[PDB]
Design a protein around this ligand. Sequence first.
Ligand SMILES: [Mg+2]
Ligand SMILES: [Mg+2]
Ligand SMILES: [Mg+2]
Ligand SMILES: [Mg+2]
Ligand SMILES: [Mg+2]
Ligand SMILES: [Mg+2]
Ligand SMILES: [Mg+2]
Ligand SMILES: [Mg+2]
Ligand SMILES: [Mg+2]
Ligand SMILES: [Mg+2]
Ligand SMILES: [Mg+2]
Ligand SMILES: [Mg+2]
Ligand SMILES: [Mg+2]
Ligand SMILES: [Mg+2]
Lengths: 100, 139, 123, 128, 109, 201
Amino acid sequence: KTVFAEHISDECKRRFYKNWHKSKKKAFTKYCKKWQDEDGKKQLEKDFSSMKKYCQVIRVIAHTQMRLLPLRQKKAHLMEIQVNGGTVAEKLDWARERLE
Amino acid sequence: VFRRFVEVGRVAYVSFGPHAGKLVAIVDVIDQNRALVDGPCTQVRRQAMPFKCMQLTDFILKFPHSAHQKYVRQAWQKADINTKWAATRWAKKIEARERKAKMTDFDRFKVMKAKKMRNRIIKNEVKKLQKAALLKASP
Amino acid sequence: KQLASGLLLVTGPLVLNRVPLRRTHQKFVIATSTKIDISNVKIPKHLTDAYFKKKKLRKPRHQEGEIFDTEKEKYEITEQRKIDQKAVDSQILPKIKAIPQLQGYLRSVFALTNGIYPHKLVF
Amino acid sequence: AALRPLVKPKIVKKRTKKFIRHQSDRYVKIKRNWRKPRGIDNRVRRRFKGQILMPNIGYGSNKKTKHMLPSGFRKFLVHNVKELEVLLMCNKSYCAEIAHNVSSKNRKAIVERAAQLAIRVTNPNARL
Amino acid sequence: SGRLWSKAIFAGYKRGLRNQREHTALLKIEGVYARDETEFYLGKRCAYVYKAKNNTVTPGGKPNKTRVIWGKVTRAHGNSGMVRAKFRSNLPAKAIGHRIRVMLYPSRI
Amino acid sequence: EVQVLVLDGRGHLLGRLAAIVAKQVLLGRKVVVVRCEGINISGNFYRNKLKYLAFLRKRMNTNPSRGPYHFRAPSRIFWRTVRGMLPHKTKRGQAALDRLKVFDGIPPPYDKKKRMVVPAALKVVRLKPTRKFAYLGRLAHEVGWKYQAVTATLEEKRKEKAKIHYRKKKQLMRLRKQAEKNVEKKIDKYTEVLKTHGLLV
RNA sequence: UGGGCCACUUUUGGUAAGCAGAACUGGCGCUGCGGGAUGAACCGAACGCCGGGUUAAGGCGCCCGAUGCCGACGCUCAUCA
RNA sequence: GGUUGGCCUCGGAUAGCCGGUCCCCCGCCGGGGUCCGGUGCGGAGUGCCCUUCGUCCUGGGAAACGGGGCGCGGCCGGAGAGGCGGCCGCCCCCUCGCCCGUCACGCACCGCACGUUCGUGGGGAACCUGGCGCUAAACCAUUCGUAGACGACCUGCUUC
Ligand SMILES: [Mg+2]
Ligand SMILES: [Mg+2]
Ligand SMILES: [Mg+2]
Ligand SMILES: [Mg+2]
Ligand SMILES: [Mg+2]
Ligand SMILES: [Mg+2]
Ligand SMILES: [Mg+2]
Ligand SMILES: [Mg+2]
Ligand SMILES: [Mg+2]
Ligand SMILES: [Mg+2]
Ligand SMILES: [Mg+2]
Ligand SMILES: [Mg+2]
Ligand SMILES: [Mg+2]
Ligand SMILES: [Mg+2]
C-alpha cells in the first residue's frame, strides 16, 4: 500500500506530467481531500495500521527541490528510500512524523 | 508395536485371491513368502498361500505345527472362531460393506429418506446444544 | 402385461407420477428388482396395440396447404381412455399403498449424481 | 414432381476427392491434371506414407452405379429433337441434357418435346 | 430432472504409434478402470453433444445451437476401463479430452 | 470430474506424480499441485543435486539468453518435469499444459480446500524404507531458489490457522456425538433403517 | 543390362578399416508397410479400394495405442548407476 | 462456447497411528502425564452432505427457541494471489416446508434423440429508463543537450 501526504509540492507534481505547460495540474487533487474529510482519515489511519501489521520492509518517497538548483530543470526527482533500523511499527511512525 | 505375528495356529483373513473373504489358520510357514494354510471349518482345504493375501487377526489356535486336518478342525471348533469372528467388529464391518453394495434402487430411496430425517434431527439438536452452550458470562 | 407387438404395456399410477396407460419399449427401460403381485388383476381385453396406435387426421381433400389446420394440436384424451385408466389404477393403487413408501418411490425420478455409477448399481 | 428412375441403388464412391498431381500446389506451371511420377527418387511414386495418393484400378466404381448421376440417371448429350427420340424407350435410366451450343429458341422445343415424352432433362432451364 | 447419462471423455482414436484410425474412438468412462467393469456399457449408445453458430432443428423442441454426433460402444480397449466406440461420423480432433455421454440406451440390465 | 483436482505435493515422488498429472491433464481435469517444495526424489541428495548442476551446464554457448531456461523454484522445476512428458509443441499439449497450476506452499485459494493424495506416487509406498531421498525444497534452495525461508514462515503460519480450524472441527464433532446420544429415542427407528443397508455398523 | 552394394556363415591380403578380393543363400538396387526414437540392407511381413476380427516382430509409467495385474522369485546403490 | 450437485482446509507418522477423559502447568480456554476406546483406518474420500414431479383436502410425528426476504444498518475475521467468510439490531409473513399417511388433480401430447444444470454465463455494439457523480491526458509541432546515425532519451514554455 502507498500513502501520500497532502500538500505535495508543485515540483513534485511536475514529475507526474510529461507536459506541464498543457496540463491543468489535477494530479493528487482528489487524494488530498481525503486528508481533510472525516471519512478519509479513518481510511488513511486504517491504511497505516494495515501497513504496520502486514508489511516487512517500508520505504519513504522523497523528492529533491529543483528551485534551489542552477539547472534549467524544474521537475523534481522521485525515489523510494528504504527505512532501516527498527520494528515496522516504530519505523512507520518515524516516516509519518517526517511526512511533508 | 507388532501386536499380531505369524505363528502356528494364527488365524488369517484372506483379502484377495481364490479364497478372498475366507478365514484361514496358519498351519506352517515355508520359504519366507508362502505359508501352509488350512480352513477346515471355512471351506478352504489345506494348501500353500502367500503372506500377501493374508491379513492376520487376533485369534490363535493351539495345535502343533503341520498337524493333520482333524486336529486343526477340533482346535477350530473348540473356542469356535466362526462365532468370535463375525460378532467381531472387523467382520461385522465387512458385512456392512457387503449389504451396502447389494442395496437396490428402492432400498437406496428408503435409505435416503431416513438419512434425510436422521440428519434433520441431529442438525437441529446441535443448534440447540450450541446455543444452550453459548450463555457464558463468567469473569 | 406385454403386448403382441413386443412393446411393454406399462402404467404409472397416473395419480402418482403422471404416466398413463402407455406402451414402452423393452429395450429402453431398466428392470428394478422391486415387484408387486399384480396377480388377481383384471386388465381389460381391449388394451391391444391397435388401441394404443397413434391416430391421424390430415389431410382430407386438401393438397396445397395455404390455409392451415389450426385444430387437433390438442390430442384429445378420449373419455374411453380415462375410464380404462380409472379401472386399472383403482385396482392397482391399494396394492401399492400396501407396501410402505412405494407411493413416494414412484413419485420420484431416477437420476445419476456425481457419486454412483450405473455399472456398480444393483437394480 | 420430377421423373423418378427405374431403380435408385445406393451410389458408393471409393473416393470423392480429386487425384491432384504431385507438387501441383507448389507451382502454377503444374496443373492439377494427374501425371504419373516417373522419378528415380520420387516418394509419391514409391508410395510412402502420408504422400499424395496415386490413382489405380482399385478405386474403380461399381458396374451397377458407374456413370450414374446423383439421381438414379445416366447422361446423354442431345443436340436436336431427333436425338431426343432415341431416348423414348429408355426413358427411365437415361436422361437427356442439351449441349451448350444449342440456341435459346431451339432448346425450348427440345424441353417441350422431352416433357411430353416423359424424358428427364438435366438442364431444362438454360436460356431463360 | 437428472443427469441420466454416465460421463465419459474422448481420449483419442484407436491408433498404433505412427498410424491413427479415426473411424473408431477410445473413451474413458468415469468409474470404470478394469475390463470386467466395461461389460455393462458394451452396447450403450454414446453421444458427442456440442454447440455451433447456426441454429439446427431439434427433435421435439424448437431449433437451437446444440448439435450431436451419435455413436455407440463397440467393445473394451485394454485391461483398464477404456471402451472404444464407433460414431456415425468420425469425431473431430477438437473433441479430444471433452465430454462424451453414455446414455444407458439399449439396456440389458 | 469437472472440479479442479488439487494435489498436495508433500511426500510424492517427482516423476511418479508427474506421470499421473500429465495423463490426468491430457484428459481435461484441471490439476492444481501445491506444496511443490515437499516433493521427494529418490536417491541421495548429492547425486540429485549433481543431476541439476549438469542441467545447469546445458546452455546455448553462442547466446545463453536463448538456451535452456533453468527454473529454480520447486514449482517451476515440477512444472518442467510435467512439461517434458506432454506433447507441448502441439496445440493439444499446450492446451493440456495450461490446465496445470503449480505452487510453492499453499496460496490462499487452496489453503481452505481438501487436498488429494496419489498413493501410486507416494514416497512411502514406492520407496524401500532404507533408501536415501532428496527434498525438492532443499535441492532448489541450493541451486538458486531465493524463497525457501519466506515460504517456510508462511507455511508455518498457515499451519497455525489450520490447527485452529481442526480445533473447531473436533469441537463440532464432539457436539454432534453428544447430540446423537441426546436424541436417540426419536432417531432409533431411523438409525436401524440405515443400519440394515450397510451404513452405520 | 554388362559401374553394383549389403547381411549370416566360409574365406584371402592387411595391425585394422564404414578397406581390398572370393564362395553360398537372401536382400537392397527395383520396395512400400509394422518394429529397431532416427537409418538403402537388421527383425516381421511384401502392397488393388475398403469394413470387421486376429496376429507377427516389437511393446504396454507419460510423451505414445496397450499391465490402472493387489503379477511371482531373487539380485543390485553407483559423489561418471 | 464449455459443463450437466457440493465437500469450507489439522499437522503428519509409516518398526506405528486416531479419538475421548481425570489430575499438573500457561494470563477460564490451551500444553503435559495417567486412564479409556478404535486400528485392515467406520469420527471411514471404498467417505460424508444435499437431494427437485408440483400442488389441493387430511391426520400422526421433527420442531415452536424458525425460516426465507440480492430487505435494511452495523460489527468482526481473512494480505501468500486478502476479491472471502462469519456475527448482531430493526422491519414481512406463516406455521409453509423435513418423515410417514388421507385425498384428488395437472396436456395423460397416444414407445423414441440434442431432455435435466451451472446460468440472470462470458464478450461487442445499441435503445429506452431513473438516482448519484467527474470535467483529463498522451503524442506531434516548438525548445533543451545531461542525449543522439535516425528513432529514442533528458528538459522548458503568462504565476508570487
Ligand atoms: Mg472423382
Ligand atoms: Mg498448380
Ligand atoms: Mg533410388
Ligand atoms: Mg461460350
Ligand atoms: Mg542469477
Ligand atoms: Mg556402364
Ligand atoms: Mg568388400
Ligand atoms: Mg525383384
Ligand atoms: Mg523390402
Ligand atoms: Mg519402419
Ligand atoms: Mg537405436
Ligand atoms: Mg484391419
Ligand atoms: Mg515404444
Ligand atoms: Mg496409454
